[PDB]
């Protein structure tokens, strides 16, 4: 996260740190005790195998994510229409071998409903252990920042992303830069508050640099993916 601040315990209880070989690789968002939403580009081969992955919940500091204490991942599912070259449909699901135990530090975020009637420049939050400036290292502590939605028509302007933003994509941040997600935040949450409920609107997907002018963050449009998510969840329930 660029231009944010360190998070307090329980501030973003759905945030998880996803590890491979005992190091943070990507972020994710808890939606049920077993299911985590992340980005498809995080689980490209050879990282498509679930046994590589462990999730850490309710912990702010990477130093405090002890090897062997993370929740082992049982299943990894990339969106079937994911295109690695264009990053279209950049969403993936991660199912844990053991269910999480919810508390003041670990809670799920709500999946978005149709008819949210979000404002065009809706006020949102992003969080993660991504670098605090472009090409920096993973952050030791969890950070968070406020960003605004950017209408797709404006985001597809010739001066911004020039027709790269698909209906499976949403833009959030600032055209002046300065505040943005960054390397390491991928797969983590883009959330908004409405009707006193926190909703998962996006998962951190891609961008040109971090916090650069006219280069805002791009996020998977979770609203477009809820059908697929429910289907994977329901199919698993038929164990």
């Amino acid at each position: 996260i660029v231009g944010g601040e360190s998070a307090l315990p329980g501030a973003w209880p759905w945030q998880v740190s996803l590890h491979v070989q005992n190091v943070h690789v990507c972020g994710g968002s808890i939606i049920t005790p077993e299911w985590i939403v992340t980005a498809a580009h995080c689980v490209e081969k050879p990282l498509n195998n679930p046994w590589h992955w462990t999730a850490f919940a309710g912990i702010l500091r990477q130093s405090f994510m002890f090897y062997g204490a993370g929740y082992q991942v049982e299943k990894v599912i990339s969106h079937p229409n994911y295109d690695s070259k264009t990053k279209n449909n950049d969403i993936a699901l991660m199912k844990l071998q053991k269910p999480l135990t919810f508390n003041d530090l670990v809670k799920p975020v709500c999946l978005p409903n149709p008819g949210m009637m979000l404002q065009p420049e809706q006020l949102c939050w992003i969080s993660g252990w991504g670098a605090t400036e472009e090409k920096g290292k993973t952050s030791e502590v969890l950070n968070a920042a406020k960003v605004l939605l950017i209408e797709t028509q404006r985001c597809n302007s010739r001066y911004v992303y020039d027709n790269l933003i698909t209906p499976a994509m949403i833009c959030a941040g600032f055209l002046q830069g300065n505040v943005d997600s960054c390397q390491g935040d991928s797969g983590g949450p883009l959330v908004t508050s409405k009707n006193n409920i926190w909703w998962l609107i996006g998962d951190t997907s891609w961008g040109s640099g971090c916090a650069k002018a006219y280069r805002p963050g791009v996020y998977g449009n979770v609203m477009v993916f809820t059908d697929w998510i429910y289907r994977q969840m329901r199919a698993d329930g038929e164990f």
Partner: protein, 216 residues
């Protein structure tokens, strides 16, 4: 007769290649076979190399041995270093009547800096019944090994009444842990309220203090 001298310590990152040397003080290194034994903390030795460059059955080919005539030394080389390789390594040879060991080399695996998790434990009521109070401060899974524990009693810095113990490098995440025990009589313990453990470490931007109030 002769001695075998090894470096006290050697360090390298996972996946890299590391070599431990063993120099013979008098006579040629090639005059008697050199063996290498691995010893993890608190375990029996196991043989990883014999007859200068032979591997026992079951030892991976990441372990290799050789001898160098110019330096009069034998060398243990570990390629593709793993965290499970953290251990002490001993070379061994012999003359006409003695078995001779090198002094041992501790192999440390390098990793990123890790801040300690700090915990403080008041004395148990059961122990206080015996007249002595042991206050324990735990520093868990940190790296590197250097750490400073400072005990404070009602913000008075303590000296001379604590003892420390540190674990060897963890076989899986390469960290250390430290336990510090502050000892006081029950009579002295009940004369103060605030007991604090203050920890200084490379991974901590400022000292971390864990404390409790007696009786609260």
């Amino acid at each position: 007769n002769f001695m075998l001298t090894q470096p006290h310590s050697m360090s390298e990152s996972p996946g890299k290649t590391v070599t431990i040397s063993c120099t013979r003080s008098s006579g040629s290194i090639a005059s008697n076979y050199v063996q290498w034994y691995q010893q993890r903390p608190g375990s029996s030795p196991t043989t990883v190399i014999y007859d200068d460059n032979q591997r026992p059955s079951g030892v991976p080919d990441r372990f290799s041995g050789s001898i160098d005539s110019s330096s009069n030394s034998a060398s243990l080389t570990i390629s593709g270093l793993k965290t499970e390789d953290e251990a002490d390594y001993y070379c061994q040879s012999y003359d006409s009547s003695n078995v001779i060991f090198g002094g041992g080399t501790k192999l440390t695996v390098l990793r990123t800096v890790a801040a300690p998790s700090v915990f403080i434990f008041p004395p148990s009521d059961e122990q206080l019944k015996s007249g002595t109070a042991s206050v324990v401060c735990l520093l868990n899974n940190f790296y590197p090994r250097e750490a400073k524990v400072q005990w404070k009693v009602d913000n008075a810095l303590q000296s001379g009444n604590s003892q420390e113990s540190v674990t060897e490098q963890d076989s899986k995440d390469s960290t250390y842990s430290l336990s510090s025990t502050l000892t006081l009589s029950k009579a002295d313990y009940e004369k103060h309220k605030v007991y604090a453990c203050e920890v200084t470490h490379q991974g901590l931007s400022s000292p971390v203090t864990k404390s409790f109030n007696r009786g609260e």
